[PDB]
Amino acid sequence: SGNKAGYFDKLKGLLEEYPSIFVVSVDNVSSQQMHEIRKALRGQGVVLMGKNTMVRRALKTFMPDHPEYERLLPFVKGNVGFVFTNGDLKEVREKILSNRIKAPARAGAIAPVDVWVPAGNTGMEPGKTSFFQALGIPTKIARGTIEITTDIKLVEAGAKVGPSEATLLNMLNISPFTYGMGIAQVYDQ
Amino acid sequence: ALKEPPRDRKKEKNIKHNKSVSLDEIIEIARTMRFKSFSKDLKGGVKEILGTAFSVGCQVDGKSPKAISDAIEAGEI
Amino acid sequence: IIEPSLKALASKFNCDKMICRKCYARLPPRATNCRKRKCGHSNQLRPKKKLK
Amino acid sequence: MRYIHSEETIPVPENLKVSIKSRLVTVEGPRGKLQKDLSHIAVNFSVVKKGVIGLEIHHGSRKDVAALRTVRTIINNMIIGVTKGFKYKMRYVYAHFPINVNVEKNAETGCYEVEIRNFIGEKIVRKVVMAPGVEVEISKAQKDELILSGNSLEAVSQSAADIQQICKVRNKDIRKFLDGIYVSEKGNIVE
RNA sequence: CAUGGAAGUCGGAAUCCGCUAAGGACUGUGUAACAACUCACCUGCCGAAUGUACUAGCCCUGAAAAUGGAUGGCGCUCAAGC
Ligand SMILES: [Mg+2]
Ligand SMILES: [Mg+2]
Ligand SMILES: [Mg+2]
Ligand SMILES: [Mg+2]
Ligand SMILES: [Mg+2]
Ligand SMILES: [Mg+2]
Ligand SMILES: [Zn+2]
To answer: Which part of the chain is the Large ribosomal subunit protein uL11 C-terminal domain (chain B) (predicted)?
Structure first.
């Protein structure tokens, strides 16, 4: 538990030195997103999240260094991280909201909103028409390009997406999911 | 790009471990091209990385690339 | 010929089994002790070798 | 080591009715009614809350307490079955010789019977009688499916095992002759 | 580094660092090779015990013979057994 021991002193060093703490609700986010946001905020501020501290903040509450630590006791529920920074609250309100990735479907992901393909010309190779005929989508090949004559409903909102439609969404570059950082209430704001 | 001088044509069927290279500031200069592509703070970690990268060559003479990277006693630049 | 998924489905009931070394009994793939009584619930098992 | 108190609870949804008398359980809901007798196990039933049933054993051994969860899961399976039913699926697998089946309708009683012909190219006609309360269908969604449906898991599963156990190859290497009828998925009627 | 080709995955010998709680000169699949997938590993749920060897009490396998058969017999299970 070498990193556990290094976690105790690193956390103790950072809590006293930085007066401002920002809470972030990150869940099911790709590692590359934290890699890029870490490189973007490398100069100013350090982001660090870990396992739940059930009593580790209660120890800061027992001794009087910060009477306001015990006010933040109930706020921890699960998968909530902390951001330590010295910038202003107004400027940090939207700094970490950048780079919202476009997550593709995962062969059955529940679409919150109805997904539709607007009428147009795909322009891709007509050798993939067997995929369209698998779903029975009316498609006409014009100038070597597959064109959807009439809009066909893909999947109802809240219903499981068909595996073929989910696969077609990957090369069609359309999906209902957009993953980004979530902002939780901080300091009873 | 060192490989202990030119590798004679068709001299790779047998063992080709004769790729020893010198350990000096030349590797640190060549590291500037990478310029710490993956973070590495102020590139000190990248400097140690590139220094220990030629682990097969075992640096030059007694010194080893791993020992050189482990010993944090050289200048940053 | 048999399509691979059906061949796997049928094989799952008669190919992937454990065999006791004392009474030749068929056991589930993850078993650790024979269930029959004439061998004393022995733990001397061997996998069923496939046909190839 | 004798355990003083071991307890578990079963919630009940606001759709069906259950009544127990002399260790005889009666469950009735939208899709029918079922009966089971548990007089061979010493368990104490009680009503914990408005929609929770509790049951327990006092001064039991480890072997006696082990059986306590079995009734809990049986009663939960019955509760699910009487409100959602059960459904099993089967596939036919042959390499060269096709196997043809005929699930004829009710034979003057609630029981169904299934006739199997041309198993590994055999001229035997083999007859199976299904348990009462179980419905057998030939699927129209796509080819090569047998549909089993019913109210009770024990009857549906045992009938499926009867179908599976009746198609057997003798005096041959079964690692090579993979002919037979097997179950492939189990689930509920609704969703 | 050899290499149609082998970006970990014919292969030879090495096997480091960045940033993290963790995500590899790779755990396999896959593939011309990659990628991909997975694995390892940590975290999201959870809610108190677990795992690995040994020791000895009862019971069981090991335990096959000839007229019909003997804890003395009937019988006995919180024993009428130890
Ligand atoms: Mg033979
Ligand atoms: Mg244990
Ligand atoms: Mg006596
Ligand atoms: Mg007594
Ligand atoms: Mg006496
Ligand atoms: Mg006594
Ligand atoms: Zn055995």
So the answer is: 1-60
Distance in angstroms between the alpha carbons of the first and the last residue of chain B: 22
Q: What is the resolution of this structure in A?
A: 3.2
Interface chains of chain B (3 or more CB pairs under 8 Å): A
Task: Please choose, from the candidates A49, A63, A156, the residue with its C-alpha nearest in 3D space to the C-alpha of residue A111.
Answer: A156
D173 and C51 within 8 Å at the Cβ level: the answer is yes
Task: Dihedral sign for Cα D12, D14, D16, D19, please.
Answer: positive
d(Cα C41, Cα A141) in Å, to the nearest integer? 68
How many Å apart are CA B40 and CA B25, to the nearest integer?
19
Instruction: Please say whether the beta carbons of D184 and D87 come within 8 A.
Output: no
Shortest-distance nucleotide from A78 CA to C1': E44
Tokens of D63: 């072997």
Torsion sign across C-alpha atoms B70, B71, B74, B75: positive
Nearest-angstrom CA–CA distance, C38 and D99: 39
Q: What is the DSSP string of A101-155?
A: B-PPP-SSPBPSS-B---S-B--S-GGGHHHHHHHT--EEEETTEEEESS----B
- Residue pair A109/A154 in contact by the 8 Å Cβ criterion: no
Q: List bases, strand E, within 7 Å of protein CB.
A: 1-3, 12-23, 25, 42-46, 60-62
Q: Give the distance from residue C44's alpha carbon to the nearest chain D alpha carbon, in angstroms.
A: 23
Q: Is A42 an 8 Å CB contact of chain B? A: yes
b/e code A152-172 from CB counts within 10 Å (16+ = b)? eebbeeeeebeeebbebbeee
B39 vs B36: CA distance, rounded Å: 6
In this structure, the number of other CB atoms found within 10 A of the CB of residue D153 comes to: 17
Rounded Cα distance, A102 and A167, in Å: 15
Q: How many helices (H) and strands (E) does chain B have?
A: 3, 0
Q: Is the dihedral of CA A66, A67, A68, A73 positive or negative?
A: positive
Cα-to-chain-centroid distance, residue B12: 22
Q: Residue A4: which residues within 8 A CB-CB, separation 6 or more?
A: none
CA distance D186 to chain C (A): 14
The answer to whether D178 contacts chain C (CB < 8 Å) is: yes
In the three-class reduction of DSSP (H, G, I as helix; E, B as strand; rest coil), residue A21 is classed as strand
